[PDB]
Design an enzyme around this catalytic site. Structure first.
Site, PDB file in Angstrom:
ATOM      1  N   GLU A  86       0.799  -1.394   0.081  1.00  6.80           N
ATOM      2  CA  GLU A  86      -0.073   0.048  -0.051  1.00  6.80           C
ATOM      3  C   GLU A  86       0.940   1.338   0.079  1.00  6.80           C
ATOM      4  OE1 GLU A  86      -3.238   0.053  -0.403  1.00  6.80           O
ATOM      5  OE2 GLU A  86      -4.093  -1.898   0.332  1.00  6.80           O
ATOM      6  N   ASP A 145      -6.617   6.699  -4.711  1.00  4.45           N
ATOM      7  CA  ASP A 145      -6.100   5.471  -4.795  1.00  4.45           C
ATOM      8  C   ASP A 145      -5.893   5.044  -6.454  1.00  4.45           C
ATOM      9  OD1 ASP A 145      -8.329   4.597  -5.490  1.00  4.45           O
ATOM     10  OD2 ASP A 145      -8.727   3.230  -3.748  1.00  4.45           O
TER      11      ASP A 145
END
Ligand SMILES: [Cl-]
Ligand SMILES: [Cl-]
EC number: 3.2.1.17
Length: 162
Positions: free
Chosen positions: A11, A20
């Site tokens: 991540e 994202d």
């Protein structure tokens, strides 16, 4: 290697609101703030999550706190899920981490929809499950990460991350 290190690799860490891979507002270590297009809604969600006026920025400490919460929530979610629990229970330590990774990324609901793959993991048919997992939007959208998780399930080792 452990779950935290694993997820930190997949991540990354960002201290400022960002989008994202799907264009959703996120912060820290993969902490989704909202699916709304509004940066304000995001900023609002952020303050509510941190409990202070953040103005879209947080500290490392704060990022790590959200991360601890999210990992805990994922484990607890798996353990509460009628579909997930049995799978989890049936796996060895490494592969359990792989299942947590998927849950963290896609949500309990999302993973619970990998019916066939789940059945195969439960039957310890590694190669077959790996191939099935690959036939998904997930794999097609974030292939490098998917491949790492999939190898983890296939092999039972941390090689993909080393
Ligand atoms: Cl496909
Ligand atoms: Cl990727």
């Amino acid at each position: 290697m452990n779950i935290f290190e694993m997820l930190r690799i997949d991540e990354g860490l960002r201290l400022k609101i960002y989008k994202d891979t799907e264009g959703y507002y996120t912060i820290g270590i993969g902490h989704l703030l909202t699916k709304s297009p509004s940066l304000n809604a995001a900023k609002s969600e952020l303050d509510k999550a941190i409990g202070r006026n953040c103005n879209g920025v947080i500290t490392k400490d704060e990022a790590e706190k959200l991360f601890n919460q999210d990992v805990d929530a994922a484990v607890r979610g798996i353990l509460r899920n009628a579909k997930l629990k049995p799978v989890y229970d049936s796996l060895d330590a490494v592969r359990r981490c792989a299942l947590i990774n998927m849950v963290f990324q896609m949500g309990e609901t999302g993973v619970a929809g990998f019916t066939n793959s789940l059945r195969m993991l439960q039957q310890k048919r590694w190669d077959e499950a790996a191939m099935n997992l690959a036939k998904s939007r997930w794999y097609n959208q974030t292939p490098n990460r998917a491949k790492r998780v999939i190898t983890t399930f296939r092999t039972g080792t941390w090689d993909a991350y080393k």
